[PDB]
Symmetry: C3
Amino acid sequence: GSHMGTEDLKYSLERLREILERLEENPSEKQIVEAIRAIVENNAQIVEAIRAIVENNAQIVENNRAIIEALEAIGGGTKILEEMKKQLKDLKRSLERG
Amino acid sequence: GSHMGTEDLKYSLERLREILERLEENPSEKQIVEAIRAIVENNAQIVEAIRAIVENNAQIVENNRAIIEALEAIGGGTKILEEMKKQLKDLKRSLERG
Amino acid sequence: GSHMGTEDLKYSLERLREILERLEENPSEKQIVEAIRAIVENNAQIVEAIRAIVENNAQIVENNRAIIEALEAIGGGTKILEEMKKQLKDLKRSLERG
């Protein structure tokens, strides 16, 4: 699995903090570059973490549509059909984004 | 549409990577500032990407409530009413956050 | 509440922008470190904002499962049971991630 945890992001930034503190205490070209490096890598980690979450969210959206279809089946003939079908289409719209 | 894709974030960071590599190979005031600039802009892109996603998530939460109301209708008289109504309120709580 | 708003992230980055602009206009060791500092802090804010959102999303996933159980109850005997139960398990999988 390529899924990244929220805690994983935190731990990476804790290291970044250390580097920052070292930079502030003893400003230098080395510490500046190392600080930037860590930030650049961490930025990727954040996006990658978001990616996995978004992909999961997409599955949830699809799952939500499955509920509607099942609901409309057993609720067949009930007014709710008029509005629940509209929601399904809206979920599809969301499904195609991420 | 102002929606930003996950891939869009990646591509921006790929450019950032290039700048980092140039910085590391040839440290300089120019490369430092340019690296920082790219990071600052990319940070905005991440938040803006999150914004759109969160706004979509808010709509999903509202949509989830719509399912409950439709469900409670056809399930009227069924015990589930006691608990499903509690969920709806919880979804509302989430709806008002983002 | 420890929940952070999307707007909160924006406002922080607006300050970061100002620092960047000052850096670009007058490059200096001071502005470089201050720019990095702000970025490091803002990176934490982004992750913390994500954390709260993800935790909320987890609750939504659980809530979605509650809908299924209520649906399956009133729809008992209906074919939908075969597929809706599969979704519930998939939601559980998502619930255990974040």
